[PDB]
Design a protein around this nucleic acid. Structure first.
Ligand SMILES: [Mg+2]
Ligand SMILES: [Mg+2]
Ligand SMILES: [Mg+2]
Ligand SMILES: [Mg+2]
Ligand SMILES: [Mg+2]
Ligand SMILES: [Mg+2]
Ligand SMILES: [Mg+2]
Ligand SMILES: [Mg+2]
Ligand SMILES: [Mg+2]
Ligand SMILES: [Mg+2]
Ligand SMILES: [Mg+2]
Ligand SMILES: [Mg+2]
Ligand SMILES: [Mg+2]
Ligand SMILES: [Mg+2]
Ligand SMILES: [Mg+2]
Ligand SMILES: [Mg+2]
Ligand SMILES: [Mg+2]
Lengths: 142, 209, 176, 38
RNA sequence: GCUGAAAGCAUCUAAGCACGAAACUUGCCCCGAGAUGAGUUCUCCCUGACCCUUUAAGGGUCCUGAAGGAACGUUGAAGA
RNA sequence: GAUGUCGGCUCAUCACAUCCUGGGGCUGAAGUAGGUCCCAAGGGUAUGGCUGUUCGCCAUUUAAAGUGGUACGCGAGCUGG
RNA sequence: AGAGGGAAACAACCCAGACCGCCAGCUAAGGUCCCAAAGUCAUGGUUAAGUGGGAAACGAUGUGGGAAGGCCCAGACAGCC
């Protein structure tokens, strides 16, 4: 008798809303990474995306401890020689606040085609409003 | 301020009565007709879409014809957009003439530079030619070294090499307006502007001083 | 502590209004408002004010001693206000105030004009003197620093904008 | 300003201050005594 | 630097506030929605039957062929 | 059972322990001009005579003629002193 | 001439010596927020430096703990006359 395996055709995914106001960036990202991957469902299988769709509101209101608001640096290389760009946390918030949460979660997801598929189920919004009311997303008080 | 779309007629000179020759570029600026107005509500940004010139009815397609008929203007040879500054209002179908530059002192002219085709590094990047004599073997106009040894082990992105030169969008900034001839649809700017004779030019007031 | 353990007597004519942590004070010289730190609660009483370290924060006593000194100057600003005097030293140096803008001639090739912030008054009893008056002790001290910054007193002849009270220590140019 | 690894009080008026994690010596009397650890 | 305690003083700092460079982020120019996160706006075009089958994002026949595109030709200050 | 070895040419690229330009503190800083240290790598940073020379010396400039890494960068790019 | 697990990767380090099969269980080193299997475990402390997650002489009213000492309501320490 073989171990059960979930099938991509028959797996159901729910929609959730999370308010990132005041939450610690990292301790919020781990909970998102769990549910985006499906580690909270008994039918979890490694090669199938059994996760949920999650909407994150108020991404610009996310909190960090210590001096990380001004000292956490985000590096990236443009591919051109000498093209090493950097941006601290608070200017990432001022310019692209959604990128902060997306980057943190992306690092906690598996790397590869399936990991990139899980990341598509994450909808991050800087403000308080979202236009996914048609999906009837359930409040996830995390 | 918004700009206008004209055509490069050519170059000539204007003699000033005090004995100074001013090299000018003649730009034919016919009436620019507004074909569409975009606003924050429907498009998310404020701009106008203008056309100019004329076009034979047998060369306009039904999608383009319906766009001009929506505005109620005759079909031109193309469409161009201009971002509206705060306070500028325009209505569709309104015609804009060259006298808009009556008090403008300096302009920026945008055009498509003349195409040089596939150009070597000497012409395209001002590389130095190697020796013509003194033993040089088949290496007179070649670019020479293109990198360092194994440590990078690659050629860096953006290296200057031979390739297509010209035939691209080029803007010349802060050109003095010598004369605005409204009744003849002429605009004389001092200096040279990109593009060949007969190419389309976009003339805007100078964004800098 | 020792500063925070001295209650601030609020005299008659001035009133206080505590709203959680944000405090405001009105008086004849104007009104001021200021948010205090979360590490300190201020207890209102009869015409005297008491500051103490709110539990849950280790630096309360250090933070408390500031609020004491903070509103102690707030109550002085709404009754007596604050005054600082600058005296210009040097030939050609002369200041004149029109409206809320100072017109200083500090030997520059261009006139320097400093715009007063809302709430601070100025006047020049003479050409080489300027007196400022206002309610907030921090703001009047800041404005005086900016005017002094235009031409700081040099150590060879004392020329430049200086505080009327402070002493500049000059030195001679070593010959030979 | 003397930028050295060993900052010390050079006279009676020198005061040790720590500003932004940098030990400094400020002297109200001798401007030569101004130091900072670095 | 201002205010200011810890530390009755002092203190640019611990709470708070202000300045401060060709560096940084913008501003200038160019590319840019394969930005697969593939966006937006405007306009245009197509409004027939019928059969089969395991009956579905199914297959097939007849009729129909638009907007537009490509091809071909004359070519270009566009171009291997 | 081969990793072509100096210098030059061409073309570079990075580091900052900065030569110039920018911002400062101190000065045995009057001014001009310097000395020294701190911050700063955006851009810039000679042509000749002699020598295979790197270097150096010399002539004359320049705001300055920076120091290093890159197989003492670069011969399936040139040269061959 | 030695696989397996750990040390990110890593013959020689740590755990441990692979006869074969199992979609059983218990452990070792090492681990238990996510990548990535297991404590967002419990109790009491310390650190504010992202220290942890590289380094010396030496410098410093950083801060925790401990044991004494000098002076002091015959008024000390600081400030002010
Ligand atoms: Mg051509
Ligand atoms: Mg040459
Ligand atoms: Mg040959
Ligand atoms: Mg490589
Ligand atoms: Mg071989
Ligand atoms: Mg080099
Ligand atoms: Mg440096
Ligand atoms: Mg810049
Ligand atoms: Mg070499
Ligand atoms: Mg080679
Ligand atoms: Mg030979
Ligand atoms: Mg391993
Ligand atoms: Mg065995
Ligand atoms: Mg077990
Ligand atoms: Mg796990
Ligand atoms: Mg716990
Ligand atoms: Mg570390």
């Amino acid at each position: 008798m073989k171990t059960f395996t979930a099938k991509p055709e028959t797996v159901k995914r729910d929609w959730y809303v999370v308010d990132a106001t005041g939450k610690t960036l990292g301790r919020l990202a781990t909970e998102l990474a769990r549910r985006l991957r499906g580690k909270h469902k008994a039918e979890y299988t490694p090669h199938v995306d059994t996760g949920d769709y999650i909407i994150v509101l108020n991404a610009d209101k996310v909190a960090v401890t210590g001096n990380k608001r001004t000292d956490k640096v985000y590096y990236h290389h443009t591919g051109h020689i000498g093209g090493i760009k950097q941006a601290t946390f608070e200017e990432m918030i001022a310019r692209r606040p959604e990128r902060v949460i997306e980057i943190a979660v992306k690092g906690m997801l598996p790397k590869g085609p399936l990991g990139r598929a899980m990341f598509r189920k994450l909808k991050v919004y800087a403000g308080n409003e979202h236009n996914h009311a048609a999906q009837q997303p359930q409040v996830l008080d995390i | 301020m918004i700009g206008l779309v004209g055509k490069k007629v050519g170059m000539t000179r204007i003699f000033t009565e005090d004995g100074v020759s001013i090299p000018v570029t003649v730009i034919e600026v016919e009436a620019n007709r507004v074909t569409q107005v975009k606003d924050l509500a429907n498009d998310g940004y404020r701009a106008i879409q203008v056309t100019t010139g004329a076009k034979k009815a047998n060369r306009v397609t039904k999608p383009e014809a319906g766009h001009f008929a929506k505005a109620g203007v005759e079909a031109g040879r193309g469409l161009w957009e201009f971002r509206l500054a705060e306070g500028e209002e325009f209505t569709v179908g309104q015609s804009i003439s060259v006298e808009l530059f009556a008090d403008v002192k300096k302009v920026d002219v945008t055009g498509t530079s003349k195409g040089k085709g596939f150009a070597g590094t000497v012409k395209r990047w001002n590389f130095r030619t190697q020796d013509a004599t003194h033993g040089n073997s088949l290496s007179h106009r070649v670019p020479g070294s293109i990198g360092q040894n194994q440590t990078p082990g690659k050629v860096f992105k953006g290296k200057k090499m031979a390739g297509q030169m010209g035939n691209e969008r080029v803007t010349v900034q802060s050109l003095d307006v010598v004369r605005v001839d409204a009744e003849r649809n002429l605009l004389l700017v001092k200096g040279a502007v990109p593009g060949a004779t007969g190419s389309d030019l976009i003339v805007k007031p100078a964004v800098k001083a | 502590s020792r500063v925070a353990k001295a209650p601030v007597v609020v005299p008659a004519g001035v009133d206080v209004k505590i709203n959680g942590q944000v405090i405001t004070i009105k008086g004849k010289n104007g009104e001021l408002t200021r948010t205090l730190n979360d590490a300190v609660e201020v207890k209102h009483a009869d015409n005297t004010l008491t500051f103490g370290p709110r539990d849950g924060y280790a630096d309360g006593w250090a933070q408390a001693g500031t609020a004491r000194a903070l509103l102690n100057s707030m109550v002085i600003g709404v009754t007596e206000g604050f005054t600082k005097k600058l005296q210009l030293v040097g030939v050609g140096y002369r200041a004149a105030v029109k409206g809320n803008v100072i017109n200083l001639s500090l030997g520059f090739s261009h006139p320097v004009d400093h715009q007063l912030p809302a709430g601070i008054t100025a006047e020049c009893p003479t050409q080489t003197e300027i007196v400022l008056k206002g309610a907030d002790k921090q703001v009047i001290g800041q404005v005086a620093a900016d005017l002094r910054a235009y031409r700081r007193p040099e150590p060879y002849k004392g020329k430049g904008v200086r505080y009327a009270d402070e002493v500049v220590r000059t030195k001679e140019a070593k010959k030979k | 300003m003397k930028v050295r690894a060993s900052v010390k009080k050079l006279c009676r008026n020198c005061k040790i201050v720590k500003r932004d994690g940098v030990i400094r010596v400020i002297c109200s009397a001798e401007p030569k005594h101004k130091q900072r650890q670095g």
